[PDB]
Curated annotation (Swiss-Prot), chains A, B:
Record-annotated HTH tetR-type domain positions: 1-59
InterPro entries, per database record: EthR_C (IPR049397), Homeodomain-like_sf (IPR009057), HTH-type_TetR-like_transc_reg (IPR050109), HTH_TetR (IPR001647), Tet_transcr_reg_TetR-rel_C_sf (IPR036271)
PANTHER family associated with the record: HTH-TYPE TRANSCRIPTIONAL REGULATOR ETHR, HTH-TYPE TRANSCRIPTIONAL REGULATOR RUTR
PROSITE patterns on file: HTH_TETR_2
DNA-binding region: 22-41
A Pfam family matched in the record: EthR_C
A molecular function (GO) term: transcription cis-regulatory region binding
Protein's recorded name: HTH-type transcriptional regulator EthR
Length: 190, 190
């Protein structure tokens, strides 16, 4: 029933925003009463928070698997494989991504959830850039953590604008090549 | 009196969000009645739209002046000078920038205003990258317009996160050097 509320909410977010979705709409869809819904979730906001949490953790766990299982290819394809975890994971959950992003303005818990994982992904990127510099593969240019921060923020804004079909945006079919180019040139360039 | 409403609103946005500012608060501050306020502006939303419009046009006009008056320095400093128009202009109007950005979620007019200028600044960046490639200064890598789009979206997200003191963010004293590095390496790198 928890899963049916989550699936119903993800389905309804494809067609319209959270503002335009009611607890009644969510309960109706999961085959339960308004009061039974409130046993599982304090609000329609708490339902989005859970969905965004699953997407963010799915992305995180897939990046952990990648880190532990290095791909055997040139650095450019190694980087593409990694940026692709975020392209595929968030790109398979566009509605939750769109509404998760809006909800950062209004929800302290969503803002904190996003803040914690971005800190984690930036720190991993900084550690990878430092390891590439120690092994002599990348030159010592910007502070690694400041470079990693800007490249992660770029990816957040650029992936999400592509997913939303925003004007302006990189066409979704071109966004992965675009971000890999900028990571590789900015990390390895003198 | 229009100017006094605008100045009052900019002042009040330093201390709290638009949601927490009333028409009465804006009228009080400009030394006028609620009804006299509504002669000048249909809403507190229309007041933000005007303020964001002044900032965006101040940025645009400063970039036009730069384009017409090339700085006489190496390419790296030419690019820094340009990114600095956005750093200084939006950085001198942090509260309007912060609330202008939030208001994109809720205001079609703010979303369209932002969309028009980003299209204009991306097109200028694409034309500059193409001119650098025609003169043999930059290699033909990514489509210029897709590169320009990603670099402009990076700058929007990275400048605004710095201004807001977001976690995570590039410290404001480091953000200009960070974006110039990534523009120069991604535009001139092979
Ligand atoms: C060549 C060798 C030295 N590398 C190859 C790559 C790897 C191991 C060592 C393995 C990997 O996969 C990898 C991945 C990231 C990464 C990618 C993208 C984001 C990213 O886009 N985050 C912003 C974001 C968040 C949420 C929504 C949208 C955007 C973050 C980190 C960094 C470093 C890596 O090292
Ligand atoms: C070396 C020679 C070939 N160039 C030198 C630079 C120049 C002439 C030719 C002159 C210039 O000043 C210049 C500036 C931009 C520019 C910079 C930043 C943004 C930018 O950050 N926009 C996103 C944004 C919007 C609003 C808030 C925050 C961020 C856009 C365009 C591009 C191209 C230029 O050509």
């Amino acid at each position: 029933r928890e899963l049916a509320i989550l699936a119903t909410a993800e389905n309804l977010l494809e067609d319209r925003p959270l503002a335009d979705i009611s607890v009644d709409d969510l309960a109706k869809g999961a085959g339960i009463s308004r009061p039974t819904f409130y046993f599982y979730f304090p609000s329609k906001e708490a339902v989005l928070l859970t969905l965004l949490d699953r997407v963010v953790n799915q992305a995180d766990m897939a990046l952990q698997t990648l880190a532990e299982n290095p791909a055997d290819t040139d650095r450019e394809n190694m980087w593409r494989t990694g940026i692709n975890v975020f392209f595929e994971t968030f790109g398979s959950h566009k509605a939750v991504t769109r509404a998760g992003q809006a909800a950062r303005a209004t929800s302290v818990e969503v803002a904190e959830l996003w803040s914690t994982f971005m800190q984690k992904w930036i720190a991993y990127t900084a550690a990878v850039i430092d390891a590439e510099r120690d092994r002599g593969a990348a030159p010592r240019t910007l502070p690694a953590h400041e470079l990693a921060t800007a490249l992660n923020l770029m990816n957040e804004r650029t992936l999400f604008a592509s997913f939303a079909g925003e004007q302006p945006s990189v066409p979704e079919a071109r966004v992965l090549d675009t971000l890999v180019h900028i990571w590789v040139t900015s990390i390895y360039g003198e």
